[PDB]
Assembly symmetry: C3
Homo-oligomer: 142 residues x 3
Amino acid sequence: MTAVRRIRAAALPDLPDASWSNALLVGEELVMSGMTAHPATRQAAERGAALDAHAQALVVLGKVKALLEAAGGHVGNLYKLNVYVTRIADKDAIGRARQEFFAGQGTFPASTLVEVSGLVFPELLVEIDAWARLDIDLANCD
Amino acid sequence: MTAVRRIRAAALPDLPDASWSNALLVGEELVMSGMTAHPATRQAAERGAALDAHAQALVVLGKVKALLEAAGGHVGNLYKLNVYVTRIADKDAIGRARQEFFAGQGTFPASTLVEVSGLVFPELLVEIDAWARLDIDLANCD
Amino acid sequence: MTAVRRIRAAALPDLPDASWSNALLVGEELVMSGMTAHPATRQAAERGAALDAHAQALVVLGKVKALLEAAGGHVGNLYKLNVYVTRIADKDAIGRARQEFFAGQGTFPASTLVEVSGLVFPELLVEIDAWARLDIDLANCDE
């Protein structure tokens, strides 16, 4: 048997209506729900300054970082990022966000990037499903 | 060196022409193909009463449950659900379905839900790619 | 602690501008980026001989095999293929590609196949996200 511990980042509570866990530590594997820039996108757009894809990607990767750190991990634990965009033209902005986020770090996670037809809120331009485990570090890759 | 076993559910016969396996037990991981409410959805549509996203989501989760059980597992082994919908407005219907399906159960699997442009049959509103491990039980989440 | 090593296939250079790794061997797990038939698809389309979905899926599966081989593996190591197509009508063409690619074994990887609204190059009809482990062989399941 392998222990499952639910990971809680204070900024990302699993609210009463939700039928998912944001993060579950299953052995060394940090299993994460897809992350989006909501509600920061909601506020920002309502105030007449919607977040572009680059800003949204950084907000999303920041959420992933928060989950990792809440579980006792770090950005180097990430081994794969599945990126869903609403506009394939935004792929380069996502790349730029990743270059900044992983500025560390000699080696990037694997990735798949596709354009989907829609995300859970209309302000969103991107959602990232991240995969990590706490027993690896890409920063020191063989 | 790791054992793999083909897992077949009685309720869901694998057809000999398919270029995929419904389920493979790879060590303690139960690797599943995406599940849909077809062909129940075709019959329903043809009889003039198509399955809504709630009904389809329950059919889908029932198939995931059948595969788990065929492996000697249970619904508590699930740690992630990737949900693909054809209409993002159905996200709440899918949520209602998950609340029912996991009525057990303290802790929900992680999730990503996106709207895709199309599914393999035109009557479909949802497909779920489910991830599970036989050595965990989310009912015992810390 | 689990060792990770970056796997480099010659035919699939990681280009230093990329913010992803084509393949990472993480213990026994070969973690791979999504594979597409670009740039072969661009050459083919320019030539007036655009690759159809079946041809593209085979090029993609060949790339996956190149990555597997670069890590000392083989196609029996594959246990899941998630397939993103631009046209759902092409699902059977992906099926045909798989039957040919897996001609040597009876047991296929698990799969999810969905239609996306776009891929990273306009000539693309398919992208496949492949999951593999070096310590399994699906051919052992055949019954």
